[PDB]
Amino acid sequence: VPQELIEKIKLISPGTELRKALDDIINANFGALIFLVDDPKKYEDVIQGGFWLDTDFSAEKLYELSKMNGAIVLSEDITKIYYANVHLVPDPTIPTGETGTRHRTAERLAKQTGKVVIAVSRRRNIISLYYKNYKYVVNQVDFLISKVTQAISTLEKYKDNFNKLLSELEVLELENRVTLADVVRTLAKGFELLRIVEEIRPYIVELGEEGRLARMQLRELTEDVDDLLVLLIMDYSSEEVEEETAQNILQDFITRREPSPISISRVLGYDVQQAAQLDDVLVSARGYRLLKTVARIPLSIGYNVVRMFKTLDQISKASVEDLKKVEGIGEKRARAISESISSLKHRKT
Amino acid sequence: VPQELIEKIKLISPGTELRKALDDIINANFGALIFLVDDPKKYEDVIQGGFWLDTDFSAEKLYELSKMNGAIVLSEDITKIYYANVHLVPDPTIPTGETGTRHRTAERLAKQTGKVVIAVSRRRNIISLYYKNYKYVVNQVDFLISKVTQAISTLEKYKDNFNKLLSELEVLELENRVTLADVVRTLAKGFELLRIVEEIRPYIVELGEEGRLARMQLRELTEDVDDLLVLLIMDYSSEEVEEETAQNILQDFITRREPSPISISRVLGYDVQQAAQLDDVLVSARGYRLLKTVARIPLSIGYNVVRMFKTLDQISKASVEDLKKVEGIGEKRARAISESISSLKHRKT
Numbered sequence A, B: 001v002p003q004e005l006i007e008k009i010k011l012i013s014p015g016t017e018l019r020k021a022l023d024d025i026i027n028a029n030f031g032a033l034i035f036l037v038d039d040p041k042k043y044e045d046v047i048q049g050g051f052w053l054d055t056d057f058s059a060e061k062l063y064e065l066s067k068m069n070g071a072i073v074l075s076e077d078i079t080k081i082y083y084a085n086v087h088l089v090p091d092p093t094i095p096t097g098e099t100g101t102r103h104r105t106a107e108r109l110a111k112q113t114g115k116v117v118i119a120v121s122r123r124r125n126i127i128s129l130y131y132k133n134y135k136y137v138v139n140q141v142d143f144l145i146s147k148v149t150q151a152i153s154t155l156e157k158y159k160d161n162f163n164k165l166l167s168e169l170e171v172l173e174l175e176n177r178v179t180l181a182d183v184v185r186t187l188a189k190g191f192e193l194l195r196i197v198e199e200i201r202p203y204i205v206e207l208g209e210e211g212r213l214a215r216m217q218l219r220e221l222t223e224d225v226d227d228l229l230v231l232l233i234m235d236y237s238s239e240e241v242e243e244e245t246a247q248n249i250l251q252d253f254i255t256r257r258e259p260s261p262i263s264i265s266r267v268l269g270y271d272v273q274q275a276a277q278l279d280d281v282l283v284s285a286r287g288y289r290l291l292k293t294v295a296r297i298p299l300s301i302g303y304n305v306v307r308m309f310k311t312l313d314q315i316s317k318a319s320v321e322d323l324k325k326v327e328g329i330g331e332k333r334a335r336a337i338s339e340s341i342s343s344l345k346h347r348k349t
């Protein structure tokens, strides 16, 4: 959905005065047909009759005028009302898929002029926005909130299972018994969780001001999942992987490819041909996830720790003195790394 | 009913574009509140909000605008629409006996400004016009046609009875056997008939263009009745009476006085006070009616004929040469007088 169209959709999103007027208009079962132009006298050929108003916009003015027959003409920034009660006469030969004079008009005029045209039929409660060759249906808030509330509830469940996989993996990681299946299983759930966020995003945008709470909820639920999945990819890919590449992996399984077990492992660099093989492939975390997340070591410095000790298992055996020999590890980072690991080994294993 | 107000009623009479709009508005159960001014600027303190239109009037435009809440402001000549959807704010302390905000505003505003205000409420089908301290309710054509059609039917019955009275009177006149009762009975019926005409006149006016057939019917039924009654009065009053005098006696009995038998015969100059006396009072026509109406002798000249012969009976005895002595009677008018009376005597008596 092009950014160009999204800007226009904002014009009629909950919170704006225009949308507040359309809401009333929908509720009164008036229809509406609204033409958005900045230079009215250039569109003189497609606007016939009606009254020339040239007055400052308000929701209540628009509502009142919509009681009259025909169409309304506003400025593109919704600051002026230019015409009311007009007859819009776009070229009849422009192809249209719409039904009814109102919507067929809106589409043809939108195509003819490159401007926004808004149509509301008298008995339906949707707002149809036409821009160029685009058509976007904007839904009522109760409909959007229902989908979003379900989507969030769905996310809670994915997120709970992600947490349970993660904490199981944590244990395996600290005991160096991780198989590729555990890794892939965790990544896949994380991927799916983030896909859901991607799918619900348009509804949330569409909700405008009424989606503030929903955004906070998605934020709380997913706030560090992406960074976590990036560090998992860096800890378990077959060949060393820069952060940027790991993020591109994440981005791939969120959008382009489908997060299937075999596919994820293949992208991680493992020549596998069947899911049952994943349980036999032993792997060891390099230690980035633990070093960044728990020891608060910046990734830049993380690499230096890994280049030296290669795996988390070795890092967990290093003395403070050993760890200080790494570039970037003073006495505090050294004890942060060593105590955070021994603390986790004690508590979790 | 002041002529000032009658000019305003014309504005909304059948046939005008304004009335046409108002009929549509009544038909659609929209309401209306309309304010007629010549300089909107002068009245900007009683006009709040709404839309400045400043566009040419049409019925369709007024109809469309009336779909909106509030009031409409037109020029007094009903050639411009100035405002729509406005809030009218006349002085709340001005007395009014109207009901509901719409009609209380209308009457206060008209009183305050000296202008016309029109109110139509949504559920009734009347147009209320307010001018200064005047209120005039204008009716639908179908209500008016009903009363007028009845009035006409009533006039037909009065006119037939009048013709019967007259034809009997004629016979009596020609045989010189008329009594006061016969005259008074005929005048009374004539007076009552023209009263009915006077009373239905306001209905006729309210009908405007739709009153055209009604006016034609009145004209045909009453064509010569006034002249006829004037001539009767000149012929039968106690002492001789000038035409314009008799015209006033007609005016009196049509408008201000009741055409009771004693009242009529008293003002004709007879000293009776009991209705039964009229049968015993013998009268003889001067001859004006027969002279003007049948012999086609102009009143100015008939005076001289009555001057000389005094009564119809004596005129009917005069020979052509006898008549020719009168100032104005040549052989043409002399044979006209002579032959038309004798012709009448032959056929009627």
Ligand SMILES: Nc1ncnc2c1ncn2[C@@H]1O[C@@H]2COP(=O)(O)O[C@H]3[C@@H](O)[C@H](n4cnc5c(N)ncnc54)O[C@@H]3COP(=O)(O)O[C@H]2[C@H]1O
Binding pocket: A031, A033, A069, A070, A071, A086, A087, A088, A089, A100, A101, A102, A105
């Ligand atoms: N060229 C045509 N061809 C075939 N049928 C025609 C027609 N024009 C009108 N009709 C019929 O007349 C109905 C009444 O239109 P109305 O002007 O009162 O009310 C219109 C009008 O206010 C608005 N509308 C539709 N097209 C418009 C346009 N090009 N410009 C301004 N307003 C339009 O939508 C309202 C509902 O129109 P709706 O189609 O449901 O209903 C239309 C349609 O059924």
